[PDB]
Ligand binder design. Structure first.
Ligand SMILES: O=C(NCCN1CCCC1=O)Nc1ccccc1
Ligand SMILES: O=C(NCCN1CCCC1=O)Nc1ccccc1
Lengths: 348, 348, 348, 348, 348
């Protein structure tokens, strides 16, 4: 028996929806859900979504609390809907998907993914739940994650990191690295080779390789010498050029991280969502150098070096395409006399 | 298991809350409650109250659907709260009372009126419900209505009319005339002798005596002859004086009713609530005569004639106290040379 | 170049969206759309829907302004979505359908109904628009209306009336009677033989046969004689029984219409939507007789007489299925000793 | 000491703001102002404006409650702001003007109209208020109304009607016909000779000449004979052509009034504001004839007859400028072979 | 003379309500109070409460700005209402109590606590205000704080810390340690022996004893050896077990504080209010260990040790009750073979 008051009961007593019976008094004012605790109202939930406040409250309560793929991964794989769960998008404070399957009466399109209305949609299946590797088998379109091998299917090994209650982390007490599988029109796909973004914070940035350690601890000239990077324009692309009104380059998160230790800057996240490439309007506080659209990606520096060192440097400009987080990321590569001028995620 | 979706279920299938089991999907957006019917949202309730939308919805659904006293009566008797029901105020689209007893977990101050929190409050009891005469006897403060005699309790015969789902009516297939009883500080009170207002509309006004049919079809001069009203200023008080910019008199609803059939006028109900005396800012459309605060009362003309003729006409001005709807209504009486100049419900 | 200000321009200059170029300044505050006219804001639209205010505004502006089927018809035929138009539901002040095709960039699931996302949806097609008969033929699921014959397609003659800008009417300068066609899973379906509800108002009800003029001017006993209705309980079913607290019968709109001319009553439309059978919580103002769920249908009395006389009167109770507005309407038939006790649209 | 609670006090006790001292408790929730009356909240004001709720409340309370020009007049004269009063626009439920002078601390641009910020604005002055004729003389831009002669100032006799608390009326106990005066750039302007619209309702329309009683009771053919209107196309312009899907003509309010008594129609007021010419999207309920933009004007039929007969009928099409309500109203005149085809307020 | 504008004047000029005369212009839009400073609007207050925005604005303005008991203390002592002040709940951004006494017209139940409507309520009295120790004397139910002894009453010495404008602190320039007294039904109570929570921040945590210094600076094994804590399971209860999917133990704030220095984690405060035991849904960023309901209490480690060392360790599981902040806190104690397995504030 689904009810606003029982959803609130679960939130209050179990920290999320947990199928427990019970009711607490609830009041809804504008976009906020309150409950009464000893005669005073206590806020349980502020609706930041475009859904009705009580609907969004229920979907948030029923969010998946196990490590799940980051939304950018799901989006890049074309996932339209999840099977019997809600992937909560913590970057948008909203459900990652419009509709649900067997979750909520206001948003459900079906109780089970085997219903035909689900056949065209790419359904997310979680092999850690009994019976869902088998539902993927009968599913026309879908994406499946597992922790171990699936007899009859070659896996695509995903990123090391997953999202646990909006914290992106590499699990040590839980597994966050999944096998990925995908089916389009009943056919198991071969997922492409792909790099993975590292999903790190500017504030909490930690190197994950000796080259990244070398990048953070060495001066610019030393690092470029040690990894034989003359002519690839890391001065511009990675370190950043702060001498002109328009900030130069600075497209790799580790380069922002290094700069942030020395002097601060504003990153305006004008499309706040999870995505492989992030666009920021950045203002450098020390110099006043700024750029309206500064595309930023968090690649392992190692991976970025391999990408730029695997390009032909003999044309003035061209589009370079790189599979990242399973999607095709277009870069612009600009060269002159056989050296790199700039190289950036294309602003398209 | 009380819930928003169960309240909405009852509204959809039963027209109001009826204790039935069931749920329907509900979405709340701003102050409106919707439910899904074949994929589209249908409005069930627009919150016009100062309570949270889902709370007001529940109280409205749980409104008393039997004939009940008009809110003006309950207010005049000092009613603060109702025992195990909601008196819906259809003139304010809101509960007549702030709190409940045994109705709603958000507004309940108690489950039963015997709880000591209810002792200082004047609780409304309905003798048509098993056990509530006894609860009145045990209550420190209360008002009781019954359809018949309560042994030992001296009754007060109430108005003929009651409110059935916002419709004020004199019952024929149902009983609307109750005995009234009141207790203050554990002690039953004598209810005063009283007139009752008739609760008629301006649009569909109907006379209720030979005098009132006479007033509506006789011209002003022949009516005043026949009922020997010379010197009592019904020309001003009842018929209304539209010759000056300030509209004169016009304090009896029947007088407004006579005028309305001839030429229309505007009545701004600037304090929209049920009360024994109503105040309107009135604008005569024919003449442009107007008055910011025109107090209007709907007495049977008979009763008004009795009241005014009862009066000493030998003082210039004096307050005249008349008991109407159990409350004491002050009138201003202005005389000169043994005749009435004006007589109107005193503006406070 | 589609835009809010261009939609508002069309509304101001053309009365609705008309493809014209232009812009007017618009301000949006809460659910209201305003435009500046000589320095002051003028309301263009109040959002009563569950869509965002500017989206609802655009859909309303793009509403079909030709005669279209009443929403109850489209619902009864399973219509999910309209091809390249908006059917505005004037009884809900909202779009009849959640999504659009080729109307609005926020609600479009497709630009053209041939897109595969539309295949499982029953698409409404309008043969008066070039190319939409062909799109119906190619659609997996659909409902089509036409003004004339479609070669090979067996037609169903629809109701005489259609909705023109929220006004239900039988056209004289325009055609409102359409042929109807329906496809399920690629296969054209036989539409059933059916009665049609008459879609009349209680206030401005007008008879449409000699029987109906007879009902309105004959007294109850002489009408029942003349049409040999003894034992069929029109005293209860149609005329209504106001003698007890629960209002008896009164399930034909014409019966409500007869009563209304005598004495008024309240009809709470607690599920305000277009449907073949309406449910009202009704309160008779004269008697106080009332009923929480009074199902009402507007059949031509002729048709209702035909239906009830068609029935076997030899069982105590049974469900009786009648096709009305293309949907199957269950009635409860209660008999005793070969005469009718009651007969009413079954409450579900 | 100006305050929200003092404004509310005046509304409760005086029907509007009246300078009285006092306070009542007020609660504001969304756009609604409430006050406490015996423990329950009573709505005083619903904000329909684009101003903050408490500001709109104060301006509404301080509305001019004397007869004032209709907003269409003030707009046609270029009035931007009022001197020390609020002209409430009852057709928009909003102030007629954005800013105030000496009314409200949130909307005041000045305390007195002599302040230089007011010089470029056309200030409305009311000669019935001490000192405002003089303020008009000193104002750079202004419009003045008076009840009598102003020495030296050549008057313009205004319409018979004015607006008293939203009621448009020709005064009998009050004066509603004013002299009008206007100043632009310090220089008094000649106001033009002008017709005036009659400002009548469709529902309660009343004729105001022998011609207009003739139009309402004569059939179309005998009226057109008697007033020798052959060849002037009142069949189209005034009576209206309901035979085709596009409703023909019907541009005089009296013509709509004649039709309305026969059969109803819908008038969507899609730009709801006071103006000399109104535009309606009209749907004839009887025929289904409709028109997206039907311009309607309420001229005395006499005046309209005078206007159309004044015209040269020897050109196919031409713009015809007529001064109405002081503004210049363009008509389209379409002729053929020396007779009128159509004549309508030109859509801009 | 109370007014919205004078409340705003005090906020602008005195930083809070201070009884000063004056007015500033105010606009209220949705839940926000603005004032005009040189022609632009400046936000004064965003309503986060369930009260009307202007009411909450006034109660916030009139908040107590002296050190006051933390709300958890007041709640645990059953305080229903404060005498002539507002205890602002900074954890809920709301009044700590529904109603007021002599503070605000919309929420006052009385001007003085001696009124009889206050007799059943437990009223908070502040001995630092003239006359309130005496009002407590005549009060039926109440709680009283003082800075010094009260002749005739044995005190309960409260916590060292109090709340000054939402900052919990141990006063050095002001006294924050109060004497507590309580009366139920006219009888001065003996307040129980009690521990006190320390009310510290995870970010700003400072030790308040040598044992707490030892806990933060020593490694786990050393600390447990030094204070002879083998067998009491501080490894689990205090330090936390981060090796399993479900985070183990971690119920004492100092243990969270120690962990936060090394590596960060998310504490989701899903019931944001002041209370003796806090429930968090915690996600450890380093490991991915998490727990839906992790009850946390900030006891002086010393105090926690004394509690756990004063329990019988010879039953598998039982409820341990400890008076903390004057309320009864139930703990669950789990043992095996005479040693502690876990010990946590009971999730009930
Ligand atoms: O699903 C799988 N093959 C697609 C099966 N088909 C045939 C055509 C329609 C359809 O769905 N294979 C699979 C096997 C083990 C584990 C998970 C998946
Ligand atoms: O209040 C006090 N005793 C309760 C007095 N009673 C008797 C029964 C009713 C009632 O209230 N005592 C007290 C003395 C000094 C300072 C503060 C308090």
């Amino acid at each position: 028996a689904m009810s606003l008051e029982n959803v609130a009961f679960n939130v209050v007593n179990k920290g999320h929806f947990d199928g427990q019976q019970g009711e607490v008094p609830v009041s809804i004012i504008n976009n906020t859900v309150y409950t009464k605790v000893d005669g005073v109202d206590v806020e349980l939930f502020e609706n930041k979504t475009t859904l009705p406040v009580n609907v969004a409250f229920e979907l948030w309560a029923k969010r998946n609390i196990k490590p799940v793929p980051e939304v950018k991964i799901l989006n890049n794989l074309g996932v339209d809907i999840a099977a019997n769960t809600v992937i909560w998008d913590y970057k948008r404070d909203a459900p990652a998907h419009i509709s649900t399957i067997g979750v909520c009466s206001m948003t459900d399109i079906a109780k089970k993914p085997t219903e035909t209305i689900c056949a065209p949609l790419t359904v997310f299946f979680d092999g850690r739940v009994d019976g869902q590797v088998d539902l993927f088998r009968n599913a026309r379109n879908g994406v499946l994650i597992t922790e171990g091998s699936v007899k009859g299917l070659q896996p695509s090994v995903g990123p090391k990191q997953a999202s646990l209650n909006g914290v992106t982390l590499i699990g040590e007490a839980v597994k966050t690295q999944f096998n990925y599988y995908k089916k389009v029109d009943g056919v198991v796909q071969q997922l492409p080779e792909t790099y993975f973004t590292q999903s790190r914070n500017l504030q909490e940035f930690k190197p994950r390789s000796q080259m990244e350690i070398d990048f953070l601890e060495l001066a610019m000239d030393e690092f470029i010498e040690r990894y034989k990077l003359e002519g690839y324009a890391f001065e511009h692309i990675v370190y950043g050029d702060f001498s002109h009104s328009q900030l130069g380059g600075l497209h790799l998160l580790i380069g922002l991280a290094k700069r942030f230790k020395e002097s601060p800057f504003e990153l305006e996240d004008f499309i706040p969502m999870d995505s492989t490439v992030k666009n920021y309007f950045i203002t450098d506080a020390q110099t006043g150098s700024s750029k309206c659209v500064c595309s930023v990606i968090d690649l392992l520096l190692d991976d970025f070096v391999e990408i730029i060192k695997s390009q032909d440097l003999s044309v003035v400009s061209k589009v370079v395409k790189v599979t990242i987080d399973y999607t095709e990321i277009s870069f612009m590569l600009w060269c002159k006399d056989g050296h790199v001028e700039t190289f950036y995620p294309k602003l398209q």
